[PDB]
Write an enzyme that holds these catalytic residues in place. Structure first.
Site, PDB file in Angstrom:
ATOM      1  N   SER A   1     -16.604   8.033   5.790  1.00 25.66           N
ATOM      2  CA  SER A   1     -17.455   9.124   5.302  1.00 25.66           C
ATOM      3  C   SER A   1     -18.458   9.633   6.352  1.00 25.66           C
ATOM      4  O   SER A   1     -19.263  10.536   6.073  1.00 25.66           O
ATOM      5  CB  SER A   1     -18.250   8.655   4.093  1.00 25.66           C
ATOM      6  OG  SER A   1     -19.408   7.968   4.531  1.00 25.66           O
TER       7      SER A   1
ATOM      8  N   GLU B   1     -10.533   1.449  -5.405  1.00 27.88           N
ATOM      9  CA  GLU B   1     -10.677   0.312  -4.523  1.00 27.88           C
ATOM     10  C   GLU B   1      -9.411  -0.545  -4.688  1.00 27.88           C
ATOM     11  O   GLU B   1      -9.048  -0.873  -5.789  1.00 27.88           O
ATOM     12  CB  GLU B   1     -11.951  -0.459  -4.899  1.00 27.88           C
ATOM     13  CG  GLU B   1     -12.302  -1.613  -3.968  1.00 27.88           C
ATOM     14  CD  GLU B   1     -12.895  -1.149  -2.637  1.00 27.88           C
ATOM     15  OE1 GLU B   1     -13.041   0.080  -2.421  1.00 27.88           O
ATOM     16  OE2 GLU B   1     -13.216  -2.022  -1.806  1.00 27.88           O
TER      17      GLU B   1
ATOM     18  N   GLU C   1       0.842  -1.193   0.000  1.00 33.22           N
ATOM     19  CA  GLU C   1       0.000   0.000   0.000  1.00 33.22           C
ATOM     20  C   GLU C   1       0.881   1.249   0.000  1.00 33.22           C
ATOM     21  O   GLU C   1       0.614   2.204  -0.721  1.00 33.22           O
ATOM     22  CB  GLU C   1      -0.944   0.033   1.198  1.00 33.22           C
ATOM     23  CG  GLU C   1      -1.931   1.194   1.153  1.00 33.22           C
ATOM     24  CD  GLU C   1      -3.153   0.957   2.022  1.00 33.22           C
ATOM     25  OE1 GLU C   1      -3.943   0.044   1.699  1.00 33.22           O
ATOM     26  OE2 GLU C   1      -3.325   1.685   3.025  1.00 33.22           O
TER      27      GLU C   1
ATOM     28  N   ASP D   1     -10.843   3.163  -1.051  1.00 36.55           N
ATOM     29  CA  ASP D   1      -9.622   3.053  -0.241  1.00 36.55           C
ATOM     30  C   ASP D   1      -8.712   4.250  -0.425  1.00 36.55           C
ATOM     31  O   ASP D   1      -8.108   4.708   0.527  1.00 36.55           O
ATOM     32  CB  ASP D   1      -8.856   1.780  -0.605  1.00 36.55           C
ATOM     33  CG  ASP D   1      -9.630   0.523  -0.238  1.00 36.55           C
ATOM     34  OD1 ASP D   1     -10.083   0.413   0.925  1.00 36.55           O
ATOM     35  OD2 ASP D   1      -9.794  -0.337  -1.116  1.00 36.55           O
TER      36      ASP D   1
END
Lengths: 120, 126
Positions: free
Chosen positions: A25, A47, A5, A34
DNA sequence: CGGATATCCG
DNA sequence: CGGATATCCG
């Protein structure tokens, strides 16, 4: 894991995007997407998925949520998929294939995915 | 949490924005706002603040980073400030008052801030 | 989440 | 310069 990531955000940054990881949110039970990224011209709602091998399956619910966010935000909906020994690869939601009730990236779609450089 | 960001996320959603809280919004070496929002036409990068009373002080570094992020991303930079018994009010960075080394929102500027409906109304600008 | 220092407003 | 606040960092 956490490693890849970090690698994805660093690739987006090197491609000229400001990119953030999403915490939530405030209204939905699930954080979506993501990553959100922008370069002043192109905006991405991403995503992020890692898989030991194909196919990647995505639920109808998770694709619906991503598309709804992208439309409400003003972004392009994408799936970023990492396979072992492969660079991160980007799929516009329009590239996903349908199963009876859900979605997939299988061997026939995977080769169509974009390098981050092309997304820019 | 904070419960402040949460409440602002609900107001942004009611006003027609797809808004998100930014994760690891302190542990990163790069500039990043508290919230990023879009409604299909307008994009916002927001630093979120809650204070018991005025003034709100804002560091030079916090404002510079907000502007740098907003420029790279393609968004408008805003400070969102909640005071007790007042609705959220939004200040474009250009509106901030200056102190000697930093920035502030004090009695002279607070009344010029925008309500969420005026920010949402930017949707219809060309 | 909170204690303690560095910054800095006025 | 005195005391309020941003920020760091466990």
């Amino acid at each position: 894991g956490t490693r890849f990531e970090r690698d994805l955000l660093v690739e987006l940054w090197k491609a000229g995007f400001a990119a953030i990881r999403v915490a939530g949110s405030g209204v939905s039970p699930f954080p979506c997407p993501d990553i959100v990224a922008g370069n002043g011209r192109t905006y991405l709602a991403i995503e992020v998925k890692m898989r030991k091998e194909l196919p990647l399956y995505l639920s109808a619910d998770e694709v619906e949520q991503l598309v709804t966010f992208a439309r409400g935000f003003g972004a392009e909906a994408y799936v970023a998929l990492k396979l072992p020994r492969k660079k991160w690869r980007f799929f516009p939601v329009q590239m996903l294939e349908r199963t009876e009730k859900n979605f997939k990236i299988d061997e026939s779609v995977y080769p169509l995915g974009l390098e981050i450089a092309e997304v820019a």
